[PDB]
Amino acid sequence: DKKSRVLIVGGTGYIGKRIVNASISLGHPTYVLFRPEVVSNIDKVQMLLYFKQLGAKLIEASLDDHQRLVDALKQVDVVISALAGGVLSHHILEQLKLVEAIKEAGNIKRFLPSEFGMDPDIMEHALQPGSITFIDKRKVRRAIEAASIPYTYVSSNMFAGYFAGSLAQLDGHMMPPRDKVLIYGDGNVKGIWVDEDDVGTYTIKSIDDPQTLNKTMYIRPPMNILSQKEVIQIWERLSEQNLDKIYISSQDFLADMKDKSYEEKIVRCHLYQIFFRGDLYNFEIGPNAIEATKLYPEVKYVTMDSYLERYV
Amino acid sequence: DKKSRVLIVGGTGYIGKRIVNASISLGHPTYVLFRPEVVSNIDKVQMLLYFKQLGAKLIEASLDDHQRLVDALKQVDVVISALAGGVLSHHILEQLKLVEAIKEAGNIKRFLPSEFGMDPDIMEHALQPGSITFIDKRKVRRAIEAASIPYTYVSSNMFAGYFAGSLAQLDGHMMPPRDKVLIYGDGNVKGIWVDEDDVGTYTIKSIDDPQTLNKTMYIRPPMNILSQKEVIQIWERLSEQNLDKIYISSQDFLADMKDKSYEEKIVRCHLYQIFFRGDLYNFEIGPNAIEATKLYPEVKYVTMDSYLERYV
Structure with missing residues (x-):
């Protein structure tokens, strides 16, 4: 055009x-x-x-x-x-x-x-x-x-091939994992995910x-204002398998992170601003x-x- | 004490x-x-x-x-x-x-x-x-x-092992050369080199x-306000023998510095400011x-x- x-x-x-x-x-x-x-x-x-x-x-x-x-x-x-x-x-x-x-x-x-x-x-x-x-x-x-x-x-928020690929996991694999998934807290806190x-x-x-x-x-595409758990749920609905959920929280996870050194606690506490303090949609x-x-x-x-x- | x-x-x-x-x-x-x-x-x-x-x-x-x-x-x-x-x-x-x-x-x-x-x-x-x-x-x-x-x-100025020991060279090799050397500008400008x-x-x-x-x-030691050509003389013209010398200019030698990586541009900007602008002793x-x-x-x-x- x-x-x-x-x-x-x-x-x-x-x-x-x-x-x-x-x-x-x-x-x-x-x-x-x-x-x-x-x-x-x-x-x-x-x-x-x-x-x-x-x-x-x-x-x-x-x-x-x-x-x-x-x-x-x-x-x-x-x-x-x-x-x-x-x-x-x-x-x-x-x-x-x-x-x-x-x-x-x-x-x-x-x-x-x-x-x-x-x-x-x-x-x-x-x-x-x-x-x-x-x-x-x-x-x-x-x-x-x-x-x-x-x-x-x-x-523009989360690129889907970086957070929905991994399903947002702390391990860096860029694939949705079989058996487990670590969830951050509740996993109800809304995020935005974009191709x-x-x-x-x-x-x-x-x-x-x-x-x-x-x-x-x-970029806040209405349909993709989804929580962590709900993107895990589209995988579940798709692969046709229910994963074994664990869930994790704020405190010693943040001091853990504050002792696992840079680039590793940069990705954590970002991932912790996304799925805990909710800086994608909380405003x-x-x-x-x-x-x-x-x-x-x-x-x-x-x-x-x-x-x-x-x-x- | x-x-x-x-x-x-x-x-x-x-x-x-x-x-x-x-x-x-x-x-x-x-x-x-x-x-x-x-x-x-x-x-x-x-x-x-x-x-x-x-x-x-x-x-x-x-x-x-x-x-x-x-x-x-x-x-x-x-x-x-x-x-x-x-x-x-x-x-x-x-x-x-x-x-x-x-x-x-x-x-x-x-x-x-x-x-x-x-x-x-x-x-x-x-x-x-x-x-x-x-x-x-x-x-x-x-x-x-x-x-x-x-x-x-x-x-405290220049740590001697990192400047006298290098003869402020730029290839990185933390010992004084046996053969070739780069003199900054004309190499008459002052530094204070402390142990x-x-x-x-x-x-x-x-x-x-x-x-x-x-x-x-x-920390301005008297017997140690020296220039590069002068700690190079000490190296050769007393302790070793003689280095084939080369003078680099302020100019496209600031451009030499220009195409390198962020942490190399810094050392160069700091060199290319003791030996050139004179900042250890121009005040x-x-x-x-x-x-x-x-x-x-x-x-x-x-x-x-x-x-x-x-x-x-």
Whole structure:
């Protein structure tokens, strides 16, 4: 359908590839800035080549070369950053350089940061260490608005192939497990679960909208505002097997976690903000925000029934 | 010096160990705080039991636990943080949790934080990203100060084994080269290179002395304000023989620094700021502030002549 010029930086990553094919399939002339890490990464490269035999343009650029970054950005309207990796620190704060490069140029009509999760300044009163992610992304958010860039913060919640795959288990397997399932407390506390393609499709549809201007865009697809136990229940209904439930709680689980060291207590206490303090649905949308599914009613969201209807 | 009970945070890191020996040697009931480094390291645990053996008393407690910390601290009178890692600069902003316990238990008569290098208050103008060291440590200093916690900030410059022992090279090899060497700029700019065990002494003679209360002690040894070409002469032109030399420029050598990884850009920004901008010695020290060597006559510091004849 539309002609806007998007630059995706971060686009060899996990949600980035979803954003990238969304651009191309919803009519955007897409450009993908990539780093140097063509160095031994055949995987990253063949995907770029894959992106390129679809019609994308590839920009060799690094983030440190400020003058090429501005050159590059002058060629496009929107810039989407899907820049993320490990500790969610070393690579989220690189985007500051990209804000500095956007301030300097003037032709960007919209900048969408490396969000795609919980929403950093919705309190995130959060248990440490993994409180850093929301700290980092705020520095980036507060610097965008300072320099009065046009933004849309795409707070999109849980990717289904990360939490409904695993069924949210502490072991990191990306498959729903036979026999047991650990539940967090009650497992009644509501969560939101979204197909990685519905997140890309909804961010390329925010892109040029007057309505998503300086507003936070929540994807809260009505059908997928589900508790932990109810996603376990779609598996049960699907695999045709009833698992053996255990359930677990706050206190020495949080000091356990606070002694199992970083990256392990970052994923825990995030998973503990999702299914205990309930930071996915425990709040208002109201005035400086919107919902992705209300706005684009025509878009097609996948339910956790249809998403799990392939994990088996 | 003499019988104040020191608690030592970061007591198994590079300079940390050094302050523990000194603590013990100078007659203080040494109390070594340690996280679960149990979890990980054999050599850290054997190091601790060495302290234990030598005279010290061990307190295992995280920085995440306020109960253990406040109470562990009520035993002592002086805390001394030497919280290491450069990648572990999260460990500077770890001392934020600790200060909120150093005040919450009162009692402490002199807290001196994880300093031991360049003075960050020398309103660092420091290059991005290495300034993002001085930021974290300027956050603590202000926290000690508003919180009306007493202090002594030890600024001690370059640890000799890490700078004289390297001849401040950049390939990483922690011994002085036999063949090739990179000289920064022209290599005439000044550094103060101190020995790690006098860092420890001069630190410990500073904790109960009415001149260091709430000031910055610098350690500027006279026989050790030298430049890189000058500690390189000492290496060859006295102790080895002769290095084929090469001069790197301020310019596209700041670009050399430009394409590397976040923790490499930092060391470079710190090098490329002692040897180039001159920051160890391009300033006016004083007039309420003090100097270790001058203040503590009795200690016969170790020269860069004596230190590198250990490398021969």
